Amino acid sequence: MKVEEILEKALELVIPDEEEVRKGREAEEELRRRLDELGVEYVFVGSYARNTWLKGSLEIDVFLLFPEEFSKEELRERGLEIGKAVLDSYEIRYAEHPYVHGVVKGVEVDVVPCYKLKEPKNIKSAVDRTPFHHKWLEGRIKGKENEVRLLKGFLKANGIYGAEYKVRGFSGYLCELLIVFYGSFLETVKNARRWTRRTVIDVAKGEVRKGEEFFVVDPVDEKRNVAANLSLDNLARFVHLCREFMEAPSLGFFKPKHPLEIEPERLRKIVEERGTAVFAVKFRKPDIVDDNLYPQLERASRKIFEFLERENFMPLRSAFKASEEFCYLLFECQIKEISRVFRRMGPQFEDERNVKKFLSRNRAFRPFIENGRWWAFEMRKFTTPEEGVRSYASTHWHTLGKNVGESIREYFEIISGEKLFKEPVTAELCEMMGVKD
Amino acid sequence: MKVEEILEKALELVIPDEEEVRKGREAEEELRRRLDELGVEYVFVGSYARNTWLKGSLEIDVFLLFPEEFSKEELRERGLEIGKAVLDSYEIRYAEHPYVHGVVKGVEVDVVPCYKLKEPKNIKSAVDRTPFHHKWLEGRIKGKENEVRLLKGFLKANGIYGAEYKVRGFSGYLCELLIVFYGSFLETVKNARRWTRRTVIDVAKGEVRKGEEFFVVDPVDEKRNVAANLSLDNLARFVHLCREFMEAPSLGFFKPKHPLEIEPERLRKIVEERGTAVFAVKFRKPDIVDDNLYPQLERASRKIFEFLERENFMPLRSAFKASEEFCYLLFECQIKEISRVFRRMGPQFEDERNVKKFLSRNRAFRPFIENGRWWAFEMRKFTTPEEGVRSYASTHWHTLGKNVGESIREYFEIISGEKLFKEPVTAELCEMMGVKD
RNA sequence: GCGGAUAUCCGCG
RNA sequence: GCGGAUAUCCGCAC
RNA sequence: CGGAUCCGCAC
RNA sequence: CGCGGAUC
Ligand SMILES: Nc1ccn([C@@H]2O[C@H](COP(=O)(O)OP(=O)(O)OP(=O)(O)O)[C@@H](O)[C@H]2O)c(=O)n1
Ligand SMILES: Nc1ccn([C@@H]2O[C@H](COP(=O)(O)OP(=O)(O)OP(=O)(O)O)[C@@H](O)[C@H]2O)c(=O)n1
Ligand SMILES: [Mg+2]
Ligand SMILES: [Mg+2]
């Protein structure tokens, strides 16, 4: 073991190299030179300004302060104007309010506009509370900016860093707040092992209490959950990972897992041995950002799942993959084929009228009474899950999320069996089916 | 073809002919003759006495009237003595107190001991009511015996005459009580179309009312429901027939529906086109009466159905058949085969102690978290409905009804597909599957 | 965009 | 029984 | 009191 | 499971 030998070991893996530091430190100096000239207000916030970023996650967040007496467009316009005319490379994003994401001296940079604001109960735009976070954090974070790095690394290598919808994990700000609250990666990790789905972590009041859900109170605004977009499953994965760390520590907790990657042959035989219907719904990925695509991929996956559920194909698990040009909604069902015939249900024997209407209909098999009710044998539209999803996708594309549903209306495909294993989804399947090596 | 004429022609199918009527009359006289000289008290009751018996169903009922100071042991002993000593050939059967069945001059007779009783207030056995039933109906039935005969014939033709557990229909008594209420067959049929599962027919008060469920109030003991063992499905089945009749009457309603009987090859094709799984449990028939066997057959049929439903084989319908020596429980299932793997479900993530226990267990696949709970993949014991039941019948003969389960304990089989259609159940499978001719 | 809550319409029953 | 659709208020993505 | 089923009650 | 009631 030797936990602190492992902690020191992990430091060199998580702390950015001298070349990196100065690399961004040279892009920071130049970025100032170009703004100071254009004369508007700015502050550096985030993982760079507080000196908390990871080794290899060098991005610079620069908010622009704007007068209280403005309008949404006068922000959107003046901000996006500055970005492109202050960075070498540039593009666009559509979050809360559209912002610039550029590259200066080879270093990625975000540029968000927001309101100046006196004290943070005005909450005019929600991104208005970001410089306040910096204010509250700097100096309170001093001497601990390595314990923050250690945590972010611990997460990043277990896919639960980032509060983006691609992840639903811990935001960088939440990592900083935890280290303030507990005072050390390790004190955070130990205590986490007893975190519950109803744990409230009031940083400003230095107390843990019971609540409605897992709430971390923002010390800048008390009615804001810093951990709001952390999924229940990911909190569950973190709590367990801490337990498993403490109980038997290792350095491997800080190294990302390399994918499974096995023969299209072995995978074929696992499905053969599980006896399940495993299939994917392929289509062209829409041209939108991650914060937009992923929540949709999730809805699409849920809606089809609930279909498989409803039509009694008894699905096991679902998964998705976004790739270069394609997307893949992946499913595993316990029922490969279902009987053509099924039960309809009619009116109670009493209801004289609906009964003559129910028995009027033309059918291959004579109806019958059961527990004072008419029932009838009818034929299903489709007989396998694949045939079912193929029908559902065509008729219910609109309900599978806006941008994704429209990309299905244009083109979609059901791929199953040995054909499936030829697509770039092998790791996402083994993950899903819970394959060990 | 004009209602009123059809009833006329139906009478011929329903009324005992010249020969049969005085076949029993000569038997009635020798029975009086043999009883009188034993100086014992008796009344003739039932179908014969009130002269409502159906064609080909000639049976004398004689209740012996013992003074109410005897003992459930004396009238029991004396009753058999007189019963044995008055019939040509005799059997003994047990229902209330054991009584004597047999023959007099080629006519089937029942000789039942019962207490005389002055009032229908102190009723200490079901058989004690019969004298009073007759005393109430006699004379109130005169002028209407053919109308009762019609009603019994209508029911008998559609397999819902008899209150015995084998049928769960309308008793002979109930039919008479209906004709006394509605005055005629037809006025019964007309008005029956508006019976509900809550209808209450108090004959003594000559009022129809709304209660808790279908309840025909015994005029002799108004706490008794004369319609007690009429099923809901046979109440419905009748209520529907009357409607179907009135609307378009025919003699056809009074003749029995001769069984389908189709090629063991066309039936093979149906199960194919339905894509269901059809099988039977076959076992040696226990040696007990029908009112013991059928209730159990129902229970056994239910428990195995419930199993298949619980186990996710999606059962469609069930039926049973009781031949001379063997019994057959029949099932149709929507799932011919389910996957080997299923999901198990463990503790919520927070439960340290129980997660450890749950995650140590040896498995072929990595368990996973979902909605804050550990779930794990596992292997099913059986994978087809046939295998499933074999497992279930072996382990759970206990539950499938006392006498029946004991025979299933002894020996049972599962016959399915090509092998099944060779058995004597062809007629019950079709009805269950609702196959038209 | 996604999720929740409130209000309202369409469909298979 | 559900399966969709539409508006307003809320919350999240930085 | 020979019997089996079904519903209510306390578990 | 066990008891009570109803049912044929
Ligand atoms: N889900 C989020 C993301 C961001 N922020 C605010 O925006 C700042 C910068 O955002 P971001 O780049 O996403 O996080 P960083 O703190 O910069 O950490 P990192 O860059 O390593 O992700 C945060 O410090 C915080 O004040 C927030 O409150 N909630
Ligand atoms: N559910 C029943 C069945 C029968 N009985 C009584 O038992 C008598 C005779 O029984 P049974 O021979 O079985 O029927 P029958 O009424 O004589 O006519 P059938 O045999 O044609 O049905 C009837 O008069 C009736 O009073 C009764 O009280 N309740
Ligand atoms: Mg940052
Ligand atoms: Mg009789």
Give CA–CA dist A81/A84, Å, rounded: 6
Helix B145-157 to helix B3-14 angle (10° resolution) is: 90
- Write out the two tokens for A247: 């109980």
Integer CA distances (angstroms), B308 to A77, A365, B336, in order: 65, 23, 12
Q: Which residues in 61-90 of chain A line strand D, with CB less than 7 A from it? A: 61
Contact across the interface for B433 and A365, Cβ inside 8 Å: yes
User: Nearest CA to B282 among B317, B330, B334?
Assistant: B330
| Same fold across B260-339+384-437 and B340-383 | yes
How many Å apart are CA B436 and CA B39, to the nearest integer?
Answer: 59
User: Hey, which residues 262-301 in chain A have their CB within 8 Å of chain B?
Assistant: 273-277
Cα angle vertex A325, ends A323, A331, to 5°? 50
CA/C1' separation A228–C7 (Å): 27
- Alpha carbons A97 and A418: distance in angstroms, whole number: 45
Q: CA dist A266 to A231, A418, B317, Å?
A: 33, 11, 40
Q: Which ligand is nearest to the CA of B108?
A: 4
DSSP 8-state assignment for residue B42: E
CA distances to A259, A347, A357 from A351, rounded to whole Å, are 61, 6, 10
With tokens 């990790």, the residue in question is: A189
Query: Strand E: which residues 393-412 of B lie within 7 A (CB)?
Result: 401-403
Q: What DSSP designation does A421 have?
A: G
How far does residue B50's CA lie from ligand 4's centre (Å)? 10
Whether any strand D atom is under 7 angstroms from the Cβ of A47: the reply reads no
Residues found in chain A: 437
Q: How many CB atoms are located within 10 Å of the residue B23 CB?
A: 16
> Is A60:A110 a contact under the CB 8 Å cutoff?
yes
Strand, coil or helix: what is B129? Answer: coil
Ligand lying nearest the CA atom of residue B130:
2
Which burial class, exposed, middle or buried, applies to A93 when counting CB atoms under 10 A from its CB (0-12, 13-18, 19+)?
Answer: middle
CA distance A144 to A177: 11
| Strand F nucleotides where any atom sits below 7 Å of a protein CB | 6-8
Which residue out of A14, A15, A28, A47 has the highest number of ligand 1 atoms within 8 Å of its CB and is therefore the one to mutate? A47
Task: Tell if the CB–CB gap between B434 and A367 is shorter than 8 Å.
Answer: yes
| Cα-based distances in Å from B272 to B265, B387, B436 | 11, 20, 16
Please tell me the distance from the alpha carbon of residue B24 to that of residue B137, in angstroms, as a whole number.
21
CA distances from B360 to B154, B354, B356, B363 (A): 68, 10, 6, 9
The atom of ligand 1 lying closest to the CA of A164 is: 1
How many beta carbons lie within 10 A of that of residue A120, not counting itself?
19
Atom of ligand 1 minimally distant from the CA of A129: 26
**Contact A136/A45 with Cβ under 8 angstroms?**
no
In 3-state terms, what secondary structure has residue A171?
A: coil
């009359």: which residue's tokens? B25
B3 Cβ under 8 Å from any chain A Cβ: no
B121 Cβ contact partners less than 8 Å away, ≥ 6 residues apart: none
CB B99 within 8 A of CB B45: no
Helix (H, G, I), strand (E, B) or coil at B343: strand
Give burial (CB, 10 Å; 0-12/13-18/19+) of B14.
Answer: buried
Task: Report the C-alpha gap between B22 and B10 in whole angstroms.
Answer: 22
* A343 sits within 7 Å of strand C by its CB: no
Q: Does B230 touch chain A (CB under 8 A)?
A: no
Across the A:B interface, residue pairs with CB atoms under 8 Å apart total 134
A409 token code pair: 């209306």
| Cβ proximity of B74 and B97 under 8 Å | no
Return the domain boundaries, chain B.
Answer: 1-15+144-259, 16-143, 260-339+384-437, 340-383
State which protein residues have CB closer than 7 Å to strand F.
B 126, 163-165, 171, 224-225, 228-229, 291
| Contacts for A37 with CB less than 8 Å, ≥ 6 apart | none
Q: Which candidate in B341, B368, B373, B436 is best for mutational testing of the A interface (most A CBs within 10 A)?
A: B341
Tell me the angle at which helices B130-137 and B172-182 cross, rounded to the nearest 10 degrees.
Answer: 30
CATH level 3 topology of A1-15+144-259:
Poly(a)-polymerase, middle domain (1.10.1410)
Q: A16-143: what fold?
A: Beta Polymerase; domain 2 (3.30.460)
Q: Which of B147, B102, B107 is nearest to B22 (CA)?
A: B107
Nearest to A278 by CA among B315, B341, B301, B188: B341
Report the length, in residues, of chain B. 437
CA-nearest residue for atom 11, ligand 2, is B46
Residue B270 and residue B435 in contact, taking contact as beta carbons nearer than 8 Å: yes
Q: What's the gap in Å between A153 CA and the centre of ligand 1?
A: 16
Under a CB-based contact definition with an 8 Å cutoff, are residues B334 and A338 in contact?
yes
Nearest to A339 among B334, B434, B436 (CB): B334
Query: Could you identify the atom of ligand 1 that is nearest to the CA of residue A46?
Result: 17
Contact list in B for residue A369 (CB cut-off 8 A) is 233, 236-237, 240
Identify the nearest ligand to the CA of B44 by its number: 2
| Alpha carbon of A24: minimum distance to chain B alpha carbons (Å) | 39
Q: With contact defined as beta carbons under 8 Å apart, do B132 and B120 qualify?
A: yes
Residue in A335, A358, A382 to test binding to B, most B beta-carbons within 10 Å: A335
| Cβ atoms of residues A305 and A315 within 8 Å | yes
CATH numeric code, A340-383: 3.30.70.1550
Residues of the binding site of A for CTP = 47, 50, 133, 152, 161
Other C-beta atoms lying within 10 Å of the C-beta of residue B283: 24
Nucleic acid strand C: bases within 7 A of protein CB: 1-3, 13
Within 8 A of A340 by CB-CB distance, chain B residues are: 273-275
Contacts of B308 (CB under 8 A, 6+ apart): B314, B315, B331, B333, B385, B388, B389
> CA Rg, chain B, in Å?
28
Contact A205, A114 (CB under 8 A): no
A319: which strand partners?
Answer: A330
d(CA B119, nearest CA chain A) in Å: 38
Annotated binding site of A for ATP: 47, 50, 133, 152, 161
Residue from B335, B375, B432 to probe the interface with A (highest A Cβ count within 10 Å):
B335
Of A102, A115, A35, which Cα lies nearest the Cα of A71? A115
Binding region of A for Mg(2+)? 59, 61, 110
Contacts of residue B319, defined as CB under 8 A and 6 or more positions apart, other chains included, come to B301, B329, B330, B428, B429, B431, B432
CATH fold for the domain made of B260-339+384-437: Alpha-Beta Plaits (3.30.70)
Report the distance separating Cα A68 and Cα A114, nearest Å.
10
How far apart are alpha carbons A152 and A171 in whole angstroms? 9
CB-strand contact A164/D, under 7 Å: yes
CA nearest to A412, candidates A238, A286, A314: A286
Q: Rounded distance, CA A314 to CA B162, Å?
A: 44
Q: Please state, in angstroms and rounded to a whole number, the distance separating the CA atoms of residues B340 and B362.
A: 17
